[PDB]
Amino acid sequence: MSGSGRGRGAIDREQSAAIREWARRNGHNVSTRGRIPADVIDAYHAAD
């Protein structure tokens, strides 16, 4: 989201699966696209 200069998103708990599901939940282009977009990770973290 936004286009943050290294927004990052690393929690010491597994978030990667949830990022993908949250992405799917929002209808983002993940799973249909390879990897997880860092911008999507950032979006996941920014999205409250």
UniProtKB/Swiss-Prot annotation:
Annotation: DNA-binding region: 33-38
Phenotype of gene-disrupted mutants: No visible effect on nucleoid structure during anaerobic growth by whole cell staining. Sensitive to atmospheric O(2) levels, at 2% O(2) no difference in growth up to 14 days; required for adaptation to anaerobiosis, at 21 days nearly 1000-fold decrease in survival under anaerobic conditions. Consumes O(2) more rapidly. Has a significant lag in recovery from 7 or 14 days anaerobic growth. Decreased virulence in lungs of BALB/c mice; no visible lung disease at any time point. Increased sensitivity to reactive nitrogen species, not more sensitive to H(2)O(2) or mitomycin.
Outcome following mutation: residue 20 to A: Loss of activity. Can form dimers but does not bind DNA
Reported modifications of this chain: The three N-terminal residues may be cleaved by proteases in response to external stress. This cleavage may be required for oligomerization, which leads to chromosome compaction and protection.
Domain of life: Bacteria
Effect recorded for residue 33 to A: Reduced DNA-binding, in fragment 66-112
Annotated compartments: Cytoplasm, Nucleoid
UniProt record similarity statement: Belongs to the Lsr2 family.
Domain-related comment: The C-terminal domain binds DNA and the N-terminal domain is involved in dimerization. Both domains are essential for normal function.
Job description of the protein: DNA-bridging protein that has both architectural and regulatory roles. Influences the organization of chromatin and gene expression by binding non-specifically to DNA, with a preference for AT-rich sequences, and bridging distant DNA segments. Binds in the minor groove of AT-rich DNA. Represses expression of multiple genes involved in a broad range of cellular processes, including major virulence factors or antibiotic-induced genes, such as iniBAC or efpA, and genes important for adaptation of changing O(2) levels. May also activate expression of some gene.
Subunit structure and binding partners: Homodimer. May form higher oligomers via protease-activation.
Protein's UniProt name: Nucleoid-associated protein Lsr2
Parent-protein start and end of this portion: 74 to 111 of 112
